[PDB]
């Protein structure tokens, strides 16, 4: 026997109204098919409790729409084709023009690396990305598409969330007087992705809650009569504006990105997206946007293939099953790249912060592209592509220099 409470979906609610709820009783083989934070399709019988009566729903069948050896034919074509990396990058939100390297970074964050547990010491496997840019450059559109694409994911904004709604809360039941724990967004997103919009407008004492989650993947609580630890194995994708709403080319990187170094070291990639006027690029962008408004779909003027959202979700789910191992020959390339990266932060006029987390980031991105290739051994080509993406991310923060 099991009991649930089920809420209305947002599209079902009337205008200017709040959703309602109902109690569901589940028996037998239909139990343990749901947990909190899932969207379900239910069939059941509506009954009273044994002249005014209370009611419930007796469930007959339940289906997770988060979940639902079988393969589709459209996926079989891709799995036979190979070389899919460019098409997979192009297929993320095709209404948005350009940003190919940003889409590649999001594609790597959707897959991630391997967890390592050498001699009792654990290391995080997933990748963290921070986006910044000027207003009107489609950050929110990209985050919305990623939230639709990922299996288990949560979306939050900087203003609408407390540091207790992100992590976990103590709830005092007024009926019994009891104390209990209630998991927040990073707990509900466990094993998946959390998207945080308007990241620069969060308070400091709310923002500092994610320091433990982003590196140790735990939440630990000691309050009232409660003392526990919760698992939070989530990737974080964040979006923000620079420190005064626009990038200033006269001020330093640390002045433009107004974050402390301890938080900055926890992000594997940091990107900047500018908007600058140009008489040809503006016309090309206007043509693309007006075509989308005319026809309801992207132009596809080159007639190249693109992948549906459903089969892209299927392909990413296939990619997550692999665990490619690192070749020991790649050692000198990786270590020499780390030393060369650490020289510039000493000898630059406009430096950034570099710490030993960087080399682990390199290894994570190499294993992520091997997973995208569906191979089982990491190649030097994947190592080189990780280095190319890190170089692009570094060069984004000094435009026109």
């Amino acid at each position: 026997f099991q009991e649930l409470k089920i809420q209305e979906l947002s599209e079902q609610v009337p205008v200017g109204s709040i959703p309602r709820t109902m109690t569901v009783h589940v028996y037998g083989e239909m139990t343990r098919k749901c947990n909190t934070g899932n969207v379900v399709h239910v069939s059941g019988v509506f009954l009273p409790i044994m002249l005014v009566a209370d009611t419930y729903l007796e469930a007959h069948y339940i289906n997770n729409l988060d979940d639902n050896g079988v393969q589709s034919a459209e996926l079989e074509v891709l799995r036979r084709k190979g070389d899919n990396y460019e098409t997979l990058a192009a297929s993320i939100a095709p209404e948005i023009f350009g940003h190919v390297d940003v889409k590649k970074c999001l594609l790597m964050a959707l897959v991630g690396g391997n967890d390592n547990s050498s001699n009792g010491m654990k290391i995080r496997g997933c990748i963290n990305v921070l986006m910044m840019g000027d207003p009107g450059v489609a950050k929110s559109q990209l985050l919305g598409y990623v939230n639709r694409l990922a299996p288990r994911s949560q979306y939050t904004t900087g203003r609408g969330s407390s540091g207790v709604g992100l992590t976990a809360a103590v709830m005092k039941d007024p009926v019994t007087g009891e104390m209990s724990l209630e998991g927040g967004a990073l707990v509900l997103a466990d094993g998946g992705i959390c998207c945080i919009d308007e990241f620069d407008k969060m308070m400091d004492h709310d923002r500092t809650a994610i320091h433990e989650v982003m590196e140790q993947q735990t939440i630990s609580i000691a309050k009232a009569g409660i003392m526990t630890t919760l698992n939070a194995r989530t990737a974080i994708i964040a979006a923000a504006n620079p420190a005064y709403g626009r990038y200033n080319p006269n001020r330093s990187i640390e002045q433009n990105v107004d974050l402390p170094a301890a938080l900055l070291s926890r992000f594997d990639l940091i990107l900047l997206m500018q908007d600058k006027a140009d008489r040809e690029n503006d016309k090309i962008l206007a043509e693309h946007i007006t075509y989308v408004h005319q026809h309801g779909c992207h132009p596809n003027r080159e007639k190249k293939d693109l992948i549906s959202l459903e089969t892209l979700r299927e392909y990413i789910s296939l990619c997550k099953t692999y665990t490619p191992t690192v070749d020991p020959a790649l050692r000198e390339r990786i270590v020499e790249a780390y030393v060369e990266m650490r020289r510039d932060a000493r000898y630059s006029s406009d430096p950034t912060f570099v710490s030993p987390r960087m080399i682990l980031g390199i290894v994570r991105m190499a294993t992520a592209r091997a997973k995208l290739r569906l191979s089982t051994i990491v190649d030097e080509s994947d190592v080189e592509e990780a280095l190319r993406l890190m170089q692009f991310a570094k060069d984004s923060l000094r435009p026109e220099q």
Binding site: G120, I123, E178, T208, E212, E215, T228, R233, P260, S355
Partner: protein
């Protein structure tokens, strides 16, 4: 001939008893590999088990000699002997356990020609699952699960036989309580009146019962689940055998019971409540420094420990074996070794109070990406009694103790916090600079006086908290600033800073060769250290047996070094030294002598302690 069967199963009682008698008298197979908590018995003090005999026949000698009243039955041995009996034991524990007991008592009486005060009782153990994976098929079957103990109840008396007395003529009758029910007499056989008896409660017989609350381990769980809790019932001699803060494994029977809709009425709710009836608690774990004052170590391993102590490398050999995946930070590792060993205990035994603190407190402060949290995790996993807290996840009341109203009695009751659970252990506090000031300021009394005094509504008492504090933090700017002094890079009150015995400044020494070496070490994780089993025994033996005292030369030397500390701390932009630092120096000197297994502190030990204290802070 009438014959007795278990209802609906065709199991006959005596045929099991024959095979179990054979098992007791004959099994000797596993004794080459006898376990850590099972290899000693006693007639007086302690003695060691012999391999060559039938094992449970050997274990019965303890019941004869030391008058122990129970036998721990390892079920792996029974499964090796006969699976056909192991299946019956696990499938029907509520029916077969009352007869394997009788076979044990029969064999004891036959072997020794003797009686005892209570019957020898069985405790089967080492049958493993998760709390969420239980199903209605598992009701009344034998299971085993593990977790941490958070709370224990006071004792409840549970009756087994009542005593009635006639109101008219003072005649008296006993009456057994069974199946949860008693039977009341109606007619007095002496004076022949009816509906006449009254129960006399204090002339009847009771037993002990205790409730224990158990919590899930968070490690195994799938995505998105929060940990669960379970009620465990202890009867008889298992009562008060466990404390809050302990980590245990439990073997017992999984049961289910109904509940009344109204307490006034006969109707029941059709959804049942579940619990566990305990049969065995185990706390032995080999992955940690052991939890038992080191009573069971053999003479040969004691002599191996004594031989190992004569290396001149003993500090480096013990220190570098701790946290093996962490590269360099040898000075910090030596500080953590001093934290593990500690000073000499100095208690008033008439009042059971600490006269002076002997625990060592350590702060780590440095740049990002320098493995401070990883060192905290290593110390957290190594010790048996440890707690981990972090940042704004704690409150001032949750760290120490809280008051809450009881569910049924409606009284205000007191319940523990992290520092009380970490008694005789370590509390690790991560992101120490980012706590609330209200939460951080309660640490003063615990870190100095090792006690905790409370005065709230109806509750005035004092608790013991003999914990060691290990903390990690960043500077004010998150990266260390060279345009500022030490007491400006750190910003904590002097009242708080003076209570740490060691402060480690960890500033990034930027160098290409060091970068290349650390990069090689980190990349290699994807492609003469002392054994853990020897390190456990070394630390336990040293703590149980070594108590250093100061020599007179050492005391004079300590006064001279304290005067030098008072002059050095007075200079500009530096942490000042108080008389508290003299106590810190004495503690570190005693820790060094304790590592060397010496009963006396020497001038060399004082010199090493002072050098460690000085070089920890000169950065």
């Amino acid at each position: 001939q009438p014959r007795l069967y278990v209802w609906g199963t065709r199991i006959c009682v005596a045929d099991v008893q024959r095979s179990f008698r054979d098992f007791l008298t004959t099994f000797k197979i596993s004794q080459l590999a006898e376990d850590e908590n099972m290899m000693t018995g006693h007639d007086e003090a302690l003695h060691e088990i012999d391999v060559n005999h039938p094992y449970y026949m050997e274990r019965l000698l303890e019941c004869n000699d030391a008058e122990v009243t129970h036998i721990n039955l390892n079920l792996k041995h029974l499964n090796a002997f006969s699976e056909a009996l192991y299946r019956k034991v696990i499938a029907y524990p509520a029916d077969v356990i009352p007869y394997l007991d009788i076979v044990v008592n029969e064999v004891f009486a036959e072997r020794f020609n003797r009686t005892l005060a209570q019957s020898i009782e069985l405790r089967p153990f080492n049958a493993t699952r998760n709390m969420r994976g239980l199903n209605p098929n598992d009701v009344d079957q034998l299971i085993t699960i593990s977790g941490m103990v958070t709370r224990t109840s006071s004792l409840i008396p549970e009756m087994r036989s009542g005593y009635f007395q006639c109101a008219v003529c003072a005649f008296g009758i006993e009456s057994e309580v069974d199946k949860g029910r008693i039977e009341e007499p109606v007619v007095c056989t002496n004076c022949s009146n009816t509906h006449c008896f009254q129960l006399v409660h204090n002339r009847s017989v009771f037993l002990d019962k205790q409730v224990v609350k158990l919590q899930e381990s968070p490690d195994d769980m799938p995505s998105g689940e929060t940990p669960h809790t379970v009620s465990v019932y202890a009867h008889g001699s298992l009562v008060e055998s466990v404390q809050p803060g302990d980590r245990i494994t439990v073997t017992g029977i999984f049961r289910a019971t109904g509940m009344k809709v109204n307490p006034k009425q006969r109707a029941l709710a059709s959804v049942y409540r579940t619990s566990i009836d305990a049969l065995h608690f185990r706390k032995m774990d080999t992955s940690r420094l052991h939890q038992d004052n080191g009573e069971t170590i053999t003479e040969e391993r004691i002599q191996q420990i004594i031989e190992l102590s004569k290396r001149p490398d003993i500090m480096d050999a013990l220190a570098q074996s701790i946290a093996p995946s962490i590269y360099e930070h040898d000075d910090v590792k030596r500080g953590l070794l001093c934290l593990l060993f500690g000073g000499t205990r100095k208690d008033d035994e008439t009042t059971n109070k600490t006269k002076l603190r002997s625990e060592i407190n350590i702060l780590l402060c440095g740049d990002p990406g320098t493995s401070k949290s990883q060192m905290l995790q290593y110390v957290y996993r190594l010790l048996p009694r440890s707690q981990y807290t972090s940042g704004k996840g704690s409150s001032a009341v949750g760290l120490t103790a809280s008051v809450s109203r009881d569910a049924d009695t409606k009284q205000l009751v007191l319940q523990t916090g992290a520092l009380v659970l970490a008694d005789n252990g370590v509390c690790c506090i991560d992101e120490f600079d980012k706590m609330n000031e209200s939460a951080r300021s309660v640490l003063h009394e615990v870190m100095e006086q090792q006690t905790l005094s409370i005065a709230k509504a109806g509750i005035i008492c004092q608790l013991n908290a003999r914990a060691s504090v290990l903390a990690a933090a960043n500077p004010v700017d998150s990266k260390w600033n060279r345009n500022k002094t030490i007491v400006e890079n750190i910003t904590l009150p002097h009242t708080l800073l003076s209570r740490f015995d060691l402060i480690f400044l960890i500033v990034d020494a930027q160098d290409e060769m060091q970068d290349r070496r650390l990069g090689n070490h980190l990349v290699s994780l994807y492609f003469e250290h002392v054994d853990m089993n020897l390190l456990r025994d070394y630390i336990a033996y040293a703590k149980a047996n070594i108590h250093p005292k100061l020599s007179e030369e050492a005391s004079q030397f300590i006064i001279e070094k304290y005067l030098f500390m008072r002059k050095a701390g007075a200079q500009h932009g530096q942490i000042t030294a108080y008389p508290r630092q003299l106590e810190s120096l004495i503690r570190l000197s005693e820790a060094h002598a304790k590592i060397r297994l010496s009963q006396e502190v020497s001038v060399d030990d004082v010199e090493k302690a002072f050098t460690l204290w000085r070089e920890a802070l000169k950065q």
